[PDB]
């Protein structure tokens, strides 16, 4: 459906086999599904068309909010409270966005595991690796901040991690 | 609608120890000089339709005669039908 | 569309209707147990369809 | 089973342990050493997505059995032939496994006899 | 349940039935007001087995502190009717 | 925020100038209206807060507690309506005045942008509760209870005040926003240890901590029904709100310092849940159950993780509602039997069936049956504690088992079996009591539909 | 249950209790009727060997060896009637037993239904009111001084009197109210 | 309280108590819904010894059965494509050691 | 008649409501309903594309 | 929703003809199904495939040399 | 762990059932033993077989308890089997339903219990499991047959033992239809479902002839030995039980100790130290 | 002879196996008589306060009040510091706390060491 982008949540082409009746016996499934269609699907579809034309009679729109980029906590004075407040709000919005990103990737993983059935262990390694990478990044960013998390605490964690990284790189180069 | 039909109890002279294993119990008791005071009381459990008991294998084999006749009819019919 | 979902949710959904009618007047009559039994039997014969589809 | 009795109550090294079998090279017995044959390919059997444990050498009969099961649905007793063929293929696999077990046992017994003969020759 | 509403006549009839079946008592000498120790010359153990017969008969057991002091069929029927809340 | 405070203040004029027979109706109607007004604060943001002014701010931790505080007053009025029938209009008006003062003080306490103002209102909440317990209490030990319920708090509260003023001399501000944004690590020193203890102990005593929980059974047993409701529902949550607000400055010293309180809470939840099994009194039993639940909340606050805080907030709200309902049921029993012991009035289900249904629902929701918010908070705290250490699951499971055991024991002893024969003065339940229980229970099952409303700012 | 126990149990009472218990447990042992009758008659013959023993010390030595033997051979799962204190329906219907005074709390719209019953109940209440003020004096005069010695109650002795403390024993709900 | 006489007309039939009689300090522990001290046909120590012995014997025999496994006389199951390497875990960019199964 | 009214008031209205809600609200969002990707066996043809999966390796058939 | 059947007091209880024939119908049907299933697949209960004797296999098919080659 | 727990559970519960007099208690212990068997099936890594056993166990155990309930209602809420004698002719439909259900529960060829039962024993015998669990499972099957023949023998074959006032009746359409629906299920559902579902596991197509027949031989031995033991009750001889019967009757003494020792030591502490 | 039944705390002596009951004396009979006399005065008082039409309330029970007051409010005024009481209180209120502290501190020390050395494998550990 057009309601959601197909690229963000990709799906295989969903090939389906053909009916190959090997006997002359009338299977109950086809007659059952046809009586189901006649008794259920037609009234619901007609009601939906009525509802949709009533909707088209009165049309209004809503717009997604956009936010301007603001100096972060690295571009913040040690005590200038206005810039720190702006940076904190920006950091919290980024935190929510990253949470939604992990939500999307987890949804991808669950959908692949359910869809590919018995061959989930092989036919969904791409989604598993993607989730592993995004989870590693998210853990690196926000794993240990705890309650009362703040942009300054995340910055300190990052600074310590890059200190470790540069020390390890210098040691390996000079090994 | 309840069970109000004025049921009447049978005659107490009908229940006799004779014909029941309680006769054997009385014989074993008199072999020591003893007699059961309550022998006639329970004898109804051996008198009526409960006098005839059925064995374990007979109980398990409840409907084998009819089922066996049905099976033999069915296999004969199938043998006479497939041989065509 | 694919009556599997509709049937498999309708079974559980109609399993709860007598619970909704537990406050109605039929709960104060002697016909409630028959109502529940008929509802559960209908639920079973309705759930028989997704079993056939899976089969 | 008698193997349990003959192992737990007899000689430990006389009979193998199923966890580590085989412990000898395949072509140790004879040098022809034919290799086991396949009918199902990766794509068609992944499409089959039977089960991981059912993905054995008897897979083709399973695919045909599941065919027979899906096409002639209301007559759930139509294709009794494919069930028989799949059961036979699993029979064959099991007897080949039993033959491998007996093979290992007699190879180990022969090696033990050869070692005992070597010890007797050394002592002599 | 489907239990018929047993009445006093049924209780007395059944008690006299059990009393008549017992051999140690001649059926023509017993009565509703027939005593057990003196009218009939029955032992205390005989009274306790009469209590046992009644307990088997009616499907409930009488407490022994009530059982040991029941000596007539009429008072026994009265006790059992009081226990079972019998109208008439 | 004044749109809630001002009507609450105007309730005083409304009650004192009311007709001598129309005090209850007017108070109930206007309290329900004030609750409707206070519902507006639930629309929180994922951003900082609702900073109304320099003096008051609201938060998704403050908003649910504020709504519960506003909602409890009509229930307290309806519950107290019965046993105040033989009192002069002056004394009933004084009672309602104390109730309105308590609600006003709680409302001002839960916003409290500044820490000293928070402390002042948080300590002012003591006086009307003390007066209610000591004056409209039945037994002779109520005075003693009051003294306890006072001095504990004051002994806990005085160092906090000192700590507070000291902080303002070093940091320069005690506003929550500046404190959060300018927070600095606390070096591991003796002076910082004593600062931590002074800041924490005042709220720890009110929770109550397992060691310091002596006052709660006395106060609950001696208080009238309104006092028990307000003490179980809101007055225990002040410690949780205070710890949640104040732990921001205490890092990183919290990790080292928290071990004694964590051990005390984890063992004391088991200890009081077991104490509940052998209790001859309803109010004492529910008091010990409240101690167990608040000990779990203490563990959640001390762990200091997002899931911990969310579970603690949900559990605080759920326990407040459930404990208020249970105390209402117990008081319904007392006003009929005048004994306040479990074993005397028995087999009441045969005689009061709908009240038996209310008892069953309250017992189930105290038992933390899913998907009620009680279980939501319980499970969030349990998961956070498991992440903290994998051994905690044993204690949590034991607590859950004993909780189910004592809840069903309290249901069994009172509702099932055979009635006491000599009791005869038990009248069929009034519409007032049934409406009280319904208004207690329906919000819980409505809130389980929207848990995110009560999961706090870390949602 | 109806009659009040005594200050003790005599030797004959104890021997009768043991005889009853032993026969019941033996019946639980011998499921079939003929086997039970045979072994019960053997039991009674063993019991009646010592009916004429006169030594109080020998009598005490007896029935005690019997009790210890019975405890050894007591059929750890005896048969119990359903309504006995060990039965499967001992207190099934105690949930259906409601008191009498609950009818005093019925709504007048409910009391409009069943008017004859409540008229008769009013007559019963008046009877109880008069009979109680009679029974108080009757019991106060009849009781031994210093308190009663046995918890058995005297019957009524005049014409218009009723048994002392009669209301709550006559007005039991039922054995099976519903 | 379970072993109190079940035929006496107590003032409280379920609790089996009389009005003015003294109440045991641990009555709430003995309420016929909780731990009881009723006489049992087999002595307590015999019961404990028998139950402990049965449990210990079962545990030890299960351990011994773990020590001696029961198995059919057949080799391990043989799977076609490198012991099913590509669809058990995956990792197709490694090319593991190939395995050829024996014909017999 | 009783069964006729029961079959519409207790079976038909619920399936109508549930099918509407599933087809037009639940399925609107992604991944809400996920199927099994039905089994494909050699020799079948796919309606969407029309191709036929090639047959197998003609194993020796005996017994 | 049944018929009126009175208590008997020490005689055989009254028995309905409909119940007796039906009980026998179902028992006979069960036995007939068991026999039919036995007849239809006699081999299956016994087992589809014979079990080989591992001592009856010759050394040639197992790859055995006469103890001196290897 | 799952395998060992299931084996010990099924053995202990069948052994407890083997001496019980109340009908509901013995059927409940049979249900517990069946659940232990299902756990053993899970432990041998056969989940689909365990699910199939769930499906068939539901049918035949529900019909067993339904027959028991009809029996108890007919005898004025009497549950002990010592006061129940000849009901084979006094009430025939419940007799045939219970005999079918007992045959099915034990497991027989071409019976609903057979598919679950035959396969379970087949798989556990043909798997790398514990020898002790195997042995306890076989003894559990033996005890299953033994308690089935115990209940049928003591409730349907001997002379009647109920109070003389006969209120035996069955002519009620609800009971008959409800019992016969589950009867049809317990005769046909096993075959239909087993031949209807797709295959999900490797079968044990090859087997030694004696090892294929172990289930039938053990059920026949259980039947015969238990029948011969119960037949000796008619003899006019009385001896005092042994310790084994006392152990089996009091449920391994587990409900005694574990319902008096922990509770007390908890409750006391909750008043004294706490 | 038969093997002796041994009474225990949780499986008490049967009523019919007490050696004390068979040692009968006139003093014992007087004791039982006065016991039943006390029981009968209690029962008579209860029934007199019970069957009165005027009474419409709870029959207050002195025994229950004594039970509750002794359980709750009589403990501390009768308490005395004894070596047994002090040792028992110290043990049961102090030992468990230090035991659990030791367990949790050791576990967290091991976890932190595993963290610092880097071999804990916290992949997918996102919620804490
Ligand atoms: C008696 C016998 C039964 C008869 C009645 C039968 C009918 C039963 C139906 C009732 C419940 C059954 C479940 C059906 C649920 C449908 C309603 C539900 O879906 O709506 C919820 C909505 O309910 C509310 O969220 C929960 C109410 C919160 C309660 C607040 C407390 C009330 C104030 C009282 C004072 C506060 C005291 C406590 C302080 C905290 C969740 O909505 P949501 O899926 O998300 O999104 C709605 C659509 N959007 C996207 C456009 C927004
Ligand atoms: C009664 C119900 C509960 C009430 C409240 C109980 C909770 C409060 C208890 C407070 C816990 C301990 C307080 C201080 C903790 C500091 C850490 C200490 O335990 O560890 C060692 C501390 O060493 C010794 O323990 C020194 C303290 C010894 C003196 C304290 C008295 C101990 C028992 C008294 C307990 C009584 C509490 C209540 C009194 C009214 C580590 O040695 P060291 O590295 O060198 O010091 C580190 C701290 N530095 C960095 C500032 C230097
Ligand atoms: C560890 C768990 C500790 C157990 C907590 C004990 C709580 C004590 C207070 C409970 C309240 C007392 C109560 O309910 O009454 C006891 C009540 C009455 O007994 P009845 O037999 O029913 O008698 C009825 C006829 N008169 O009995 C009970 O319910 C007590 C049950 C307690 C069980 C405790 C023992 C269980 C031990 C389990 C250990 C094995 C775990 C299995 C591990 C599996 C591994 C995969
Ligand atoms: C429930 C009732 C419990 C009451 C709470 C008891 C625990 C509270 C701790 C005792 C009171 C201390 C209040 C301190 C207020 C904070 C001020 C502060 O932290 O500043 C420190 C001051 O720290 C102190 O002075 C602490 C001294 C405490 C003296 C009185 C202590 C009372 C008894 C202590 C024993 C009990 C301690 C633990 C008890 C736990 C609760 C029982 C730095 O001092 P400066 O000189 O300005 O720094 C410059 C050099 N860097
Ligand atoms: C399966 C359970 C087995 C239990 C076995 C227990 C052992 C049984 C063996 C008992 C041995 C005895 O007789 S122990 C003998 C005890 N001593 C006496 O009996 C002396 C005088 N007997 C009486 O006074 C009685 O009351 C009497 C006259 C009988 C009746 O009295 P009544 O006129 O008022 O009916």
Handedness of CA D44, D50, D52, D56 (dihedral sign): negative
For residue I57, give how far its alpha carbon lies from the nearest alpha carbon of chain A (Å): 21
Distance, CA of A36 to CA of C5 (rounded, Å): 13
**Dist CA F14 CA F24 (whole Å):** 11
B62 shares contact with chain G (CB less than 8 Å): no
Annotated catalytic residues of E are: 43
Annotate G150-164 with b (16+ C-beta within 10 A) or e (fewer).
bbebeeeeeeeebeb
Question: Can you read off the two tokens belonging to residue K21?
Answer: 């007099």
CB atoms near residue F265 (< 10 Å): 26
Owner of token pair 């098919």: J61
Q: Any idea where the domains of chain E sit in the sequence? A: 8-84
Going by C-beta distance under 8 Å and a sequence separation of 6 or more, which residues neighbour residue K140?
K7, K10, K11, K14, K33, K36, K37
Interface residues from chain D to K (CB-CB < 8 Å):
4, 18, 51, 53-54, 56, 62, 65-66, 69, 76-77, 87-88, 90-91, 94-95
Cβ atoms within 10 Å, residue E10: 18
Distance (Å, rounded) from C-alpha F116 to C-alpha F136? 31
Tokens of D102: 């007996």
Of D39, D47, D66, the CB nearest to I59: D39
Chains with 3+ CB–CB pairs under 8 A to I are A, C, D
Q: How far apart are CA F302 and CA L30, in angstroms?
A: 67
Strands of chain H, DSSP E: 69-70
Q: Which residues of K touch L88 (CB under 8 A)?
A: 273
- Longest distance between any two alpha carbons in chain A, whole Å: 85
* DSSP structure class, residue E44: H
Residue nearest to atom 2 of ligand 4 (CA): F156
- Beta-bridged to residue F341, according to DSSP, are F281
Structure tokens at A55: 């909707």
Exposure class string for K164-183: b at 16+ Cβ within 10 A, else e: bbbbbbbbeeebbebbbebb
Tokens found for residue F234: 């809101």
Half-sphere exposure of F435 (CA within 13 A, CB side): 10
Asked whether the beta carbons of J41 and K196 are under 8 A apart, the reply is: no
Cβ neighbours around F434 below 10 Å, total? 15
Whole-angstrom distance, CA of residue A149 vs CA of residue A136: 19
Instruction: At A21, list the tokens.
Output: 């009746």
Helix (H, G, I), strand (E, B) or coil at J47: coil
**Nearest-by-CA chain K residue for E2:** K167
Class of residue A166 by CB neighbours under 10 A (exposed 0-12, middle 13-18, buried 19+): exposed
Pairing mode of beta strands F50-51, K129-130: unpaired
* Eight-class DSSP state of H14: T
Question: Roughly how many angstroms between the first and final C-alpha of chain L, as a whole number?
Answer: 69
Chain E residues with CB-CB distance to K76 below 8 A: 3, 59
Contact call for residues K126 and B28 (beta carbons, < 8 A): no
Nearest to A155 by CA among A102, A80, A90: A90
Residue closest by Cα to atom 9 of ligand 1: C20
Distance CA A77, CA K17 (A): 80
- L123 three-class SS: coil
Number of Cβ within 10 Å of residue E74's Cβ equals 13
Phi and psi at K130, nearest 5°, equal -80, 135
Burial class (CB in 10 A: 0-12, 13-18, 19+), F236: buried
C-alpha I35/C-alpha I38 separation (Å) is 8
Inter-chain touch H29–K271, beta carbons under 8 Å: yes
Strand-strand pairing, F50-51 and F57-58:
antiparallel
Task: List the structure tokens of D119.
Answer: 């010890």
∠ CA F234-F235-F236 to the nearest 5 degrees? Answer: 90
Tell me which residues of chain H have a C-beta less than 8 Å from any C-beta of chain A: 86-90
Q: Please tell me which of the candidates B9, B44, B63 has its beta carbon nearest to residue J28.
A: B63
Q: How far apart are CA H13 and CA G176, in angstroms?
A: 17
Of A100, A101, A94, A165, nearest to A134 by C-alpha is A101
Closest chain A residue to L124, measured at CA: A135
The distance of Cα K223 from the centroid of its chain, to the nearest Å, equals 13
Asked if A39 and I13 count as a contact pair (C-beta separation under 8 A), the reply is: no
Locate tokens 């294993």: which residue? B21
Nearest CA to G77 out of C7, K245, F361 is that of K245
Chains in contact with chain B (at least 3 beta-carbon pairs closer than 8 A) = E, G, J, K
Contact status, residue F327 vs residue F222, Cβ threshold 8 Å: no
Return contacts of A110-114, CB within 8 angstroms, 24+ apart: A110/I31, A110/I34, A111/A9, A111/A11, A111/I30, A111/I31, A111/I34, A114/I34, A114/I36
Ligand nearest to the CA of F192: 4
Q: 3-state class of G73 per DSSP?
A: coil
How would you label K190-223 residue by residue, b for 16+ Cβ within 10 Å and e otherwise?
bbebbebbebeebebbbbeeeebebbbebbeebb
Q: Name the residue at shortest CA distance from atom 6 of ligand 5.
A: G66
Per-residue 3-state assignment (H helix, E strand, C coil) for chain I: CHHHHHHHHHHHHHHHHHHHHHHHHHCCCCCCCCCCCCCCCCCCEECCCCCECCCCCCCCCCC
In whole angstroms, give the CA distance from residue D27 to residue A146: 62
Round to whole Å and give the CA distance between I18 and C10: 7
Chains in touch with L (≥3 Cβ pairs < 8 A): A, F, G, H, K
Contact criterion met (CB below 8 Å) for D11 and D26: no
Domain E8-84 bears CATH identifier 3.40.50.1580:
no
Q: Looking at the complex, report in whole angstroms how far the Cα of residue K123 sits from the nearest Cα belonging to chain H.
A: 11
Q: Which of D15, A130, K26 is closest to H71 using CA atoms?
A: D15
CA atoms within 13 A on the CB side of F381: 30
Query: What is the rounded distance in angstroms from the CA atom of residue L33 to the CA atom of residue L30?
Result: 5
Cβ–Cβ contacts within 10 Å for residue D60, how many? 22
Name every protein residue with a CB atom under 6 angstroms from any ligand 1 atom.
C 20, 22-23; F 35, 64, 67-68, 71, 317, 443, 446-447, 449-450, 454
Q: Is I20 within 8 Å of A44 (Cβ atoms)?
A: yes
CB G18 within 8 A of CB G73: no
CB-CB neighbors (< 8 A) of F416 in chain G: 95
Question: Structure tokens of K233?
Answer: 């009750």
| Inter-chain residue contact J54 with H104, CB threshold 8 Å | no
Ligand 2 atom nearest to F190, measured from its CA: 51
Out of F149, F191, F250, mutate this one to test ligand 4's pocket (max ligand atoms within 8 Å of CB): namely: F191
What are the φ/ψ torsions at residue F345 (nearest 5 degrees)? -85, 115
The minimum CA-CA distance between G169 and chain E, rounded to whole Å, is 11
F267 to chain K: closest CA residue? K274
Which residue's CA is minimally distant from atom 11 of ligand 5? Answer: G47
Two structure tokens written together for I17: 């409501």
Q: Which chain A residues are closer than 8 Å to D53 by Cβ?
A: none
- Look at A29 and C3 and tell me if their CB atoms are within 8 Å: no
- Tokens found for residue K192: 């239909």
Interface of F with G (CB under 8 A): 349-351, 416-419, 421, 424, 427-428
Do residues G1 and E83 touch, judged by C-beta distance below 8 A?
Answer: no
For residue G153 the two structure tokens come to: 């109650």
| Alpha helix positions (H), K75-130 | 92-106, 112-125
Q: Are A74 and A154 contacting, i.e. CB atoms less than 8 angstroms apart? A: no
Interface check for I8 against chain C (CB to CB < 8 A): the answer is no
Atom 21 (ligand 2) nearest CA: F256
């Amino acid at each position: 459906p057009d309601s959601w982008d197909k690229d963000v949540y990709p799906e295989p082409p969903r090939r389906t086999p053909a009916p190959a009746p090997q006997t002359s016996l009338p299977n109950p499934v086809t007659y059952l599904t046809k009586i189901f269609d006649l008794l259920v699907d037609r009234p619901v579809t007609l009601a939906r068309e009525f509802i949709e034309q009533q909707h088209a009679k009165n049309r209004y729109y809503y717009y997604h909010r956009e936010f301007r980029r603001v100096p972060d906590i690295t571009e913040c004075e040690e005590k200038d409270i206005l810039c720190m407040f702006e940076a904190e709000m920006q950091w919290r919005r980024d935190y929510k966005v990253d949470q939604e990103i992990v939500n999307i990737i987890q949804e991808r993983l669950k959908a692949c595991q359910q869809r590919e059935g018995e061959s989930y262990r092989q036919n969904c390694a791409k989604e598993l690796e993607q989730f592993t990478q995004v989870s590693k990044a998210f853990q690196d960013r926000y794993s240990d901040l705890g309650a009362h998390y703040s942009a300054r605490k995340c910055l300190a964690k990052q600074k310590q991690r890059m200190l470790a990284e540069r020390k390890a790189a210098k040691e390996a180069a000079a090994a | 609608e309840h069970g109000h039909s004025k049921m009447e109890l049978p005659d107490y002279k009908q229940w006799k120890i004779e014909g029941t294993p309680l006769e054997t119990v009385q014989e074993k008791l008199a072999a020591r000089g003893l007699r059961d005071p309550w022998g006639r009381n329970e004898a109804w459990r051996y008198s009526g339709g409960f006098a005839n008991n059925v064995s374990f294998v007979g109980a398990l084999l409840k409907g084998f005669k009819w089922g066996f006749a049905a099976f033999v009819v069915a296999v004969g019919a199938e043998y006479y039908l497939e041989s065509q | 569309m694919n009556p599997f979902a509709s049937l498999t949710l309708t079974t559980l959904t109609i399993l709860t209707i007598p619970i909704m009618m537990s406050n109605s007047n039929i709960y104060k009559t002697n016909l409630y147990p028959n109502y529940v039994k008929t509802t559960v039997s209908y639920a079973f014969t309705l759930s028989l369809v997704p079993l056939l589809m899976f089969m | 089973g008698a193997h349990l009795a003959r192992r737990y109550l007899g000689d430990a090294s006389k009979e193998p342990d199923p966890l580590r079998m085989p412990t000898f090279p395949p072509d140790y017995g004879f040098p022809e050493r034919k290799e086991r044959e396949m009918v199902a390919t990766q794509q068609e059997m992944n499409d089959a997505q039977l089960m991981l444990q059912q993905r054995d050498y008897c897979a083709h009969y399973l695919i045909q059995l599941l065919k027979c099961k899906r096409d002639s649905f209301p007559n759930f007793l139509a294709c009794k032939h494919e069930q028989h063929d799949w059961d036979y293929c699993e029979h064959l696999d099991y007897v080949k496994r039993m033959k491998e077990f007996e093979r290992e046992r007699r190879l180990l017994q022969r090696k033990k006899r050869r070692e005992q003969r070597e010890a007797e020759m050394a002592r002599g | 349940s489907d239990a018929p509403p047993l009445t006093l006549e049924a209780i007395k009839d059944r008690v006299l039935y059990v009393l008549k079946l017992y051999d140690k008592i001649d059926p023509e000498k017993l009565s509703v007001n027939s005593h057990f120790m003196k009218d009939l010359g029955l032992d205390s153990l005989d009274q306790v087995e009469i209590i046992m017969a009644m307990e088997d008969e009616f499907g409930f057991e009488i407490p022994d502190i009530d059982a040991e002091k029941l000596m007539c069929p009429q008072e026994i029927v009265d006790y059992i009717a009081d226990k079972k809340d019998v109208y008439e | 925020m004044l749109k809630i405070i001002i009507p609450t203040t105007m309730l005083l004029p409304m009650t004192w100038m009311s007709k001598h027979n129309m005090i209850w109706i007017n108070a109930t109607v206007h309290s329900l209206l004030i609750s409707l007004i206070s519902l507006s604060l639930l629309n929180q943001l994922g951003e900082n807060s609702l900073n109304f002014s320099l003096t008051f701010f609201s938060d998704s931790l403050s908003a649910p507690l504020l709504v519960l505080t506003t909602w409890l007053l009509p229930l307290m009025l309806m519950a107290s309506q019965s046993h105040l029938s033989k009192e002069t209009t002056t004394r009933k008006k004084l009672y309602i005045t104390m109730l309105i003062l308590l609600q006003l003080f709680l409302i001002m306490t839960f916003t409290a942008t500044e820490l000293i103002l928070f402390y002042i209102l948080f300590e002012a909440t003591l006086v009307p509760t003390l007066i209610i317990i000591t004056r409209w209490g039945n037994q002779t030990e109520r005075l003693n209870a009051g003294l306890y319920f006072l001095f504990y708090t004051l002994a806990g509260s005085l160092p906090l005040l000192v700590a507070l003023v000291y902080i303002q001399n070093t940091t320069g501000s005690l506003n929550f926003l500046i404190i959060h944004y300018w927070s600095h690590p606390l070096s591991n020193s003796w002076s910082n240890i004593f600062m931590w203890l002074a800041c924490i102990m005042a709220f720890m005593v009110k929770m109550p901590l397992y060691g310091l929980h002596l006052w709660l059974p006395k106060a609950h047993v001696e208080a009238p029904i309104a006092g028990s409701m307000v003490l179980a529902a809101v007055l225990l949550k002040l410690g949780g709100y205070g710890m949640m607000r104040i732990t921001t400055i205490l890092n990183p010293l919290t990790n080292y310092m928290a071990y004694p309180f964590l051990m005390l809470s984890m063992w004391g939840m088991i200890m009081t849940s077991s104490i509940c099994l052998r209790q001859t009194d309803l109010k004492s039993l529910i008091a010990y159950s409240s101690v167990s639940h608040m000990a779990l909340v203490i563990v959640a606050i001390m762990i200091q993780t997002p899931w911990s805080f969310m579970g603690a907030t949900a559990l605080m709200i759920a326990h407040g509602l459930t404990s208020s309902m249970l105390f209402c049921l117990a008081n319904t029993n007392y006003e009929r039997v005048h004994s306040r012991t479990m074993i005397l009035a028995r087999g009441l289900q045969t005689l009061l069936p709908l009240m038996a249904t209310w008892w069953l629902v309250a017992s189930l929701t105290n038992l933390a049956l899913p998907p009620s918010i009680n279980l939501i908070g319980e499970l969030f705290i349990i998961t956070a504690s498991f992440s903290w250490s994998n051994i905690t699951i044993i204690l949590m499971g034991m607590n859950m088992m004993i909780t189910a055991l004592y809840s069903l024991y309290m249901l069994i002893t009172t509702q099932r079996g055979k009635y006491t024969h000599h009791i005869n003065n038990i009248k069929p339940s009034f519409t007032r009591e049934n409406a009280l229980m319904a208004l207690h229970i329906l919000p819980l099952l409505l809130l389980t539909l929207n848990p995110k409303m009560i999961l706090g700012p870390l949602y | 249950a109806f009659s009040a126990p005594a200050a003790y149990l005599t030797h004959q009472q104890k021997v009768l209790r043991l005889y009853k218990r032993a026969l019941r447990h033996l019946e639980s042992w011998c499921v079939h009727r003929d086997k039970y009758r045979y072994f019960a008659c053997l039991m009674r013959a063993r019991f009646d060997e010592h009916k004429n023993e006169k030594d109080m010390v020998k009598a005490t030595q007896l029935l005690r060896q019997a009790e210890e033997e019975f405890w050894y051979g007591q059929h750890p799962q005896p048969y119990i009637f359903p309504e006995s204190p060990g039965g499967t329906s001992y207190e099934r219907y105690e949930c259906y037993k409601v008191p009498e005074w609950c009818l005093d709390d019925w709504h007048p719209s409910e009391k409009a239904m069943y008017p004859d019953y409540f008229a008769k109940r009013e007559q019963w209440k008046r009877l109880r009111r008069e009979s109680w003020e009679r029974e108080v004096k009757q019991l106060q005069e009849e009781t031994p001084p210093g308190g009663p010695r046995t918890e058995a109650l005297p019957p009524a002795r005049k014409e218009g009197d009723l048994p002392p403390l009669w209301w709550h024993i006559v007005t039991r709900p039922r054995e099976r109210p519903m | 309280q379970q072993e109190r006489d079940p035929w006496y007309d107590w003032d409280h039939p379920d609790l089996r108590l009389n009005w003015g009689e003294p109440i045991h300090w641990d009555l709430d522990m003995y309420i016929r819904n909780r731990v009881d001290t009723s006489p049992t046909p087999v002595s307590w120590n015999t019961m404990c010894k028998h139950l402990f012995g049965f449990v210990a014997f079962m545990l030890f025999m299960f351990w011994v059965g773990e020590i001696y496994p029961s198995y059919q006389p057949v080799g391990p199951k043989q799977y076609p494509y490198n012991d099913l390497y590509l669809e058990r875990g995956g990792d197709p960019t490694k090319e593991p050691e190939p395995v050829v199964h024996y014909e017999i | 008649y009783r069964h006729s009214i029961f079959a519409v008031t207790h079976v038909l209205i619920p399936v109508w409501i549930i099918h509407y809600y599933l087809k037009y609200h639940v399925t609107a969002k992604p991944y809400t309903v996920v199927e099994r990707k039905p089994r494909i066996f050699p020799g079948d043809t796919i309606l969407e594309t029309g191709e036929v999966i090639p047959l197998m390796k003609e194993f020796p058939d005996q017994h | 929703g049944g018929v009126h059947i009175e208590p008997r007091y020490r005689q055989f209880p009254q028995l309905t003809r409909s119940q007796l024939i039906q009980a026998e119908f179902f028992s006979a049907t069960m036995w007939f199904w068991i026999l039919w299933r036995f007849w239809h697949d006699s081999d299956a209960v016994l087992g589809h495939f014979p079990y080989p004797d591992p001592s009856q296999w010759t050394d040639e098919e197992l790859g055995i040399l006469p103890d001196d080659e290897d | 762990m799952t395998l060992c727990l299931g084996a010990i559970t099924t053995l202990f519960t069948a052994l407890c059932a083997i001496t019980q007099n109340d009908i509901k208690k013995i059927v409940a212990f049979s249900t517990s033993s069946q659940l232990g068997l299902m756990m053993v099936t899970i432990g041998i890594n056969q989940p689909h077989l365990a699910f199939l056993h769930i499906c068939m166990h539901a049918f035949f155990k529900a019909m067993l308890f339904m027959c028991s309930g009809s029996i108890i209602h007919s005898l004025n809420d009497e549950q002990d089997i010592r006061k129940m004698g000849g009901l084979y002719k006094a009430m025939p439909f419940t007799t045939t339903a219970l005999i079918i259900g007992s045959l099915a529960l034990t497991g027989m060829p071409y019976l609903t219990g057979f598919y679950s039962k035959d396969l379970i024993i087949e798989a556990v015998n043909m798997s790398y499991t514990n020898a002790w669990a195997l042995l306890m499972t076989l003894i559990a099957t033996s005890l299953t047959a033994a308690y089935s023949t115990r209940i049928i023998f003591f409730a349907f074959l001997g002379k009647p033992r109920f109070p003389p006032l006969v209120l035996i009746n069955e002519n009620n359409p609800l009971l008959i239809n409800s019992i016969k629906r589950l009867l049809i299920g317990s005769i046909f559902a096993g075959f239909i479902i087993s031949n209807n579902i797709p295959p999900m596991t490797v079968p044990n197509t090859t087997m030694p002839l004696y090892m294929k027949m172990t289930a039938l031989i053990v059920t026949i031995m259980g039947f015969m030995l238990a029948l011969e033991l119960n037949n000796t009750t008619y003899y006019l001889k009385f001896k005092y039980p042994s310790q084994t019967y006392k152990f089996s009757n009091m449920l391994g003494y587990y409900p005694s100790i574990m319902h008096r020792l922990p509770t007390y030591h908890n409750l006391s502490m909750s008043q004294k130290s706490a | 002879s038969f093997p002796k039944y041994k009474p225990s705390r949780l499986a008490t002596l049967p009523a019919t196996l007490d050696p004390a009951e068979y040692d009968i004396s006139p003093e014992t009979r007087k004791a039982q008589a006065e016991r039943l006399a006390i029981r009968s005065r209690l029962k008579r008082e209860y029934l007199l306060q019970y069957n009165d039409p005027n009474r419409l309330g709870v029959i207050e029970d002195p025994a229950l009040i004594r039970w509750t007051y002794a359980r709750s409010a009589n403990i501390y005024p009768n308490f005395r510091p004894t070596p047994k009481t002090s040792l028992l209180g110290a043990l049961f209120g102090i030992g468990p706390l230090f035991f659990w502290y030791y367990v949790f501190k050791t576990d967290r020390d091991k976890k932190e060491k595993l963290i610092q050395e880097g071999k804990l494998d916290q992949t997918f550990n996102i919620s804490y």
